[PDB]
RNA sequence: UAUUAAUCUAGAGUGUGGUAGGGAGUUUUGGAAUUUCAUGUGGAGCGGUGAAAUGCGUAGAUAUAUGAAGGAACACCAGUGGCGAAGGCGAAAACUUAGGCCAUUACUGACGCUUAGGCUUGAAAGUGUGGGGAGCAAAUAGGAUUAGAUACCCUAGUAGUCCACACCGUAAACGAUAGAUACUAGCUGUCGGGGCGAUCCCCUCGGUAGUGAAGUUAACACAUUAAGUAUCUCGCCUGGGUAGUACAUUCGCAAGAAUGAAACUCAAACGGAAUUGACGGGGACCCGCACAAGUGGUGGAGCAUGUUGCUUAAUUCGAC
């Protein structure tokens, strides 16, 4: 699960945290639900919005490779 | 042609299609389930899907290719029967390229059967 | 619905000690007795031994082993357009079907010598020509055609 | 307790339709008596399957209701080691108004009986001294051994 | 999947990958009520939950 | 009880700090889809249900790849999750705005409840306008079972759709449950904060599914996430059909908004919950040559008796 919940910051943003993203993201470029990611609920929405931005940012593909 | 061209295999439950395209995009042969006279219900069976698979095989088994990518479009069983036919002929696979263009919400889908 | 019911076979002859031969004799027998069956068997065996020079036991076991089928078509209903799923045959059923095929193709025909009828039946079952080998071929062909039906169970 | 100080007991408990109505248990004790008297004659002389059937009826007696052999009435006090384990022994006894002693462990009111005992027996080290102290609190009446009432005797043992 | 060359390992994962692709394509290949369109996913999740807590 | 001056602050918020969320009006791009058009290939098919046909293709269709493009909305992200006036909220981003939640030993001095009247939005379908129409699409055209297939099956296919103005005003808008005040066991957990504390476990308050005792009840069952208890107001129902029928009202280009009978009938509500049955194109279940396998066997003949039929005095009569 995320280091952010283990340190305390109550938010995350795309500072190229791709490493931990690869733990939350399957190699299929699809966002696993809250169960796999391990966030509580708040860092869950934070990583959700970050992954969606990365989709928009082209950091992560939607499905196209 | 080159040892690694393109094989577009659009696997659909109804009349799976397949065609060997050049890297520039020019085909060399093609087939679809029911090519040998099975268009109807019996093309949708794995028998005619495998028939089309082996037809495009025998039209591509002599192209310099020994390991070829599978550009499977859609999700079904034409992929599995094509891989089985290729493996029974001694030709290995490099990757199952899932070529499904996942719906990005463009054209309106056809409505469900009433 | 019964899942297990033990079968039974009958006592062999004290010359060759084979249950298969008395089973085939007792299924091709007519009028209840072995008498005319014994006469027809003696005639068929003479007409066999005058040709196809080979040990009778070896030729008979070759015929019986090659006759045996490989598949079984137990009906299965889709509840729409029903499509059946093939199954397997136990060895006792294999032998039983073999002998019953021999009986039904050796009982009634329109050629002259029935002695020769059973003679030709045995010899052309031995030489792998189509008499009951085609049964194995078609029971394999049906399973080949039922490959899609046996793929998914409903 | 049954092998040291007892007047009547039941193997597990009442199975229902047996406590608030002892007719089904008076006939049970009478049929036990008559079954012993009748089976005293059965000596494998008619059918061995049938004498095994009779021994199995005896076995079912010990399992379901082997304890009801000497109780000819309805007991004035009924021990309940758990209100969630003695459904019939609590419910049928509470249909009438006989005094009842029960425990209360984790999920019930302590006021469902006459005298209140919040003690427990699920713990391995509890039921030992609990049962010994309950037994030796009544065993003195019948001029029978009493070794846990004020004596330093005690047990520290796991459940077995 | 994207890769498959193992004899017996990758096929089992490919099965669930194909199932996931089918579930994802069975909501936009044909237009329908969004009610059942989300109810299918919710029921799949609920069935997967209670079977293995 | 309305209360006077002062009032008391325990509420309404509000000084302040922390503060999470798909809250939202507004504005941006990105992913690609989709089908085409320039491009070439290529040999023989496409369409599909239970099976096919309607319907497409050598004058090059399938399929193909990049280039370029129209409308169009954003797989997953989607939870003992949160934010939500309802309706709802998720490719993102941000302007703005709203609601909070936790805590403030605090203030006006309780300054608030419902809502006549007034105000507001309102899923979605659809409408005039201007534009767009990518895509599917009713009605259906044609075709498949058919006794009918009009509903259910397939293709061709336009209204429709779509962007904004104006009109939409209803939904099974529900929590089958309008609220507001005050109070009331718990628990597995979990969410937002105050958090000691790798995260934690652990809690404080609000929330999020269930739980079961009181309580509640026609029963369903609810139960501190009441169908529990008391305080204040707006909406409704007095048996059913009639009965939303007719008039009329206000607005809406109209569909619709609300509203509502009479006459009559019946003595009942397709009135509800609950018990087992029948029941199913719902499942678990054990069973008998009943099937699965076969011998023979009748519908097959010589045929003989037997049924109907007929004839007739009855071709008795009953038996199906």
Curated annotation (Swiss-Prot), chain A:
Keyword hit for Ribonucleoprotein: yes
Keywords tagged on the record: Ribonucleoprotein, Ribosomal protein, RNA-binding, rRNA-binding
GO MF entries: small ribosomal subunit rRNA binding; structural constituent of ribosome
KW rRNA-binding (keyword) present: yes
GO biological process, one term: translation
GO cellular component: cytosolic small ribosomal subunit
Record function comment: Binds as a heterodimer with protein bS6 to the central domain of the 16S rRNA, where it helps stabilize the platform of the 30S subunit.
Subunit and partners: Part of the 30S ribosomal subunit. Forms a tight heterodimer with protein bS6.
Similarity annotation: Belongs to the bacterial ribosomal protein bS18 family.
Protein name per UniProt: Small ribosomal subunit protein bS18
Organism: Mycoplasma pneumoniae (strain ATCC 29342 / M129 / Subtype 1) (Mycoplasmoides pneumoniae)
Full-sequence range covered: 40 to 104 of 104
Swiss-Prot record, chain C:
Keywords, ordered alphabetically: Ribonucleoprotein, Ribosomal protein, RNA-binding, rRNA-binding, tRNA-binding
Superkingdom as given in the UniProt entry: Bacteria
Example of a GO MF term: structural constituent of ribosome
Xref: InterPro entries: Ribosomal_uS7, Ribosomal_uS7_bac/org-type, Ribosomal_uS7_CS, Ribosomal_uS7_dom, Ribosomal_uS7_dom_sf
BP term (GO), one: translation
Annotated Gene Ontology cellular component terms: small ribosomal subunit
Coiled coil is among the record's keywords: no
Keyword rRNA-binding tagged: yes
NCBIfam families named in the record: rpsG_bact
Role played: One of the primary rRNA binding proteins, it binds directly to 16S rRNA where it nucleates assembly of the head domain of the 30S subunit. Is located at the subunit interface close to the decoding center, probably blocks exit of the E-site tRNA.
Subunit organization: Part of the 30S ribosomal subunit. Contacts proteins S9 and S11.
Family according to the record: Belongs to the universal ribosomal protein uS7 family.
Protein name (Swiss-Prot/TrEMBL): Small ribosomal subunit protein uS7
Organism whose genome encodes this protein: Mycoplasma pneumoniae (strain ATCC 29342 / M129 / Subtype 1)
Curated annotation (Swiss-Prot), chain D:
Coiled-coil segments on the chain, per record: none
Keywords associated with the record: Ribonucleoprotein, Ribosomal protein
Signal peptide extent: none
Presence of the UniProt keyword Ribosomal protein in the record: yes
Gene Ontology molecular function: any one: structural constituent of ribosome
Origin superkingdom: Bacteria
Gene Ontology, cellular component aspect: cytosolic small ribosomal subunit
Gene Ontology biological process terms, A to Z: translation
Family statement: Belongs to the universal ribosomal protein uS2 family.
Protein name, as recorded: Small ribosomal subunit protein uS2
Species whose genome carries this gene: Mycoplasma pneumoniae (strain ATCC 29342 / M129 / Subtype 1) (Mycoplasmoides pneumoniae)
Gene: rpsB
Part of the intact protein present: 99 to 258 of 294
UniProtKB/Swiss-Prot annotation, chain E:
GO cellular component: ribonucleoprotein complex; ribosome
Record keywords, A-Z: Ribonucleoprotein, Ribosomal protein
Domain of life: Bacteria
InterPro entries listed in its UniProt record: Ribosomal_bS21 (IPR001911)
GO BP: any one term: translation
GO molecular function, a single term: structural constituent of ribosome
Protein family: Belongs to the bacterial ribosomal protein bS21 family.
Protein name: Small ribosomal subunit protein bS21
Organism: Mycoplasma pneumoniae (strain ATCC 29342 / M129 / Subtype 1) (Mycoplasmoides pneumoniae)
Taxonomic lineage of the native organism: Bacteria, Bacillati, Mycoplasmatota, Mycoplasmoidales, Mycoplasmoidaceae
Gene: rpsU
């Amino acid at each position: 699960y995320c280091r952010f919940c283990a340190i305390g910051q109550l938010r995350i943003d795309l500072i190229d945290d791709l490493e931990a993203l690869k733990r939350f993201l399957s190699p299929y470029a699809k966002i696993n639900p809250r169960r796999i990611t391990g966030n509580c609920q708040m860092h869950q929405r934070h990583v959700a919005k970050a992954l969606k931005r990365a989709r928009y940012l082209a950091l992560v593909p939607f499905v196209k490779d | 042609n080159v040892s690694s061209g393109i094989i577009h295999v659009s696997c659909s439950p109804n009349n799976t299609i397949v065609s060997a395209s050049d890297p520039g995009g020019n085909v060399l042969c093609w087939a679809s389930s029911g090519t040998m006279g099975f268009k109807g219900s019996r093309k949708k069976t794995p028998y005619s899907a495998g028939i089309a698979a082996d037809k495009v095989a025998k039209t591509v088994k002599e192209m310099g290719m020994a390991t070829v990518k599978l550009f499977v479009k859609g999700t079904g069983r034409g992929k599995d029967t094509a891989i089985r036919s290729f493996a029974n002929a001694g030709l290995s696979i490099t990757e199952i390229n899932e070529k499904t263009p996942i719906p990005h919400n463009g054209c309106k889908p056809p409505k469900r059967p009433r | 619905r019964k899942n297990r019911a033990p079968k039974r076979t009958v006592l062999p002859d004290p010359v060759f000690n084979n249950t298969l031969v008395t089973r085939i004799i007792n299924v091709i027998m007519e009028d209840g007795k072995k008498g005319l069956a014994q006469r027809i068997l003696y005639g068929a065996f003479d007409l066999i031994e005058q040709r196809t020079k080979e040990k009778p036991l070896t030729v008979f076991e070759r015929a019986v082993g090659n006759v045996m089928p490989r598949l079984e078509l137990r009906v299965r209903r889709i509840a729409g357009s029903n499509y059946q799923v093939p199954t397997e045959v136990p060895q006792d059923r294999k032998i039983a079907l073999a002998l019953r095929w021999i009986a039904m193709f050796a009982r009634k025909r329109h050629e002259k010598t029935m002695l020769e009828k059973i003679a030709n039946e045995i010899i052309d079952a031995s030489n792998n020509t189509g008499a009951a080998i085609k049964k194995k071929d078609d029971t394999h062909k049906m399973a080949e055609a039922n490959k899609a039906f046996a793929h998914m169970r409903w | 307790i049954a092998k040291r100080v007892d007047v009547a007991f039941i193997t597990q408990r009442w199975l229902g339709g047996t406590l608030t109505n002892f007719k089904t248990l008076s006939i049970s004790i009478n049929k036990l008596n008559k079954l012993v008297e009748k089976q005293a004659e059965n000596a494998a002389d008619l059918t061995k399957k049938e004498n095994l059937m009779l021994s199995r009826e005896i076995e079912r007696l010990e399992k379901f209701f082997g304890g009801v052999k000497s109780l000819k009435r309805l007991p004035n006090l009924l021990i309940v080691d758990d209100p969630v384990y003695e459904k019939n022994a609590v419910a049928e006894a509470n249909i009438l108004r006989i005094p009842v002693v029960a425990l209360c462990n984790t999920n019930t009111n302590p006021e469902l009986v006459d005298f209140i005992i919040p003690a427990n027996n699920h713990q391995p080290q509890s039921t030992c001294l609990l049962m010994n102290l309950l037994a030796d609190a009544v065993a003195e009446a019948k001029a029978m051994p009493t070794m846990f009432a004020y004596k330093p005797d005690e047990e520290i043992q796991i459940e077995i | 999947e994207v890769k498959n060359d193992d004899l017996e390992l990758a096929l089992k994962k490919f099965k669930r990958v194909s199932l996931e692709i089918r579930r994802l394509a069975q909501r936009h290949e044909y237009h329908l009520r969004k009610g059942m369109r989300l109810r299918e996913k919710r029921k799949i999740a609920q069935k997967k939950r209670r079977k293995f807590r």
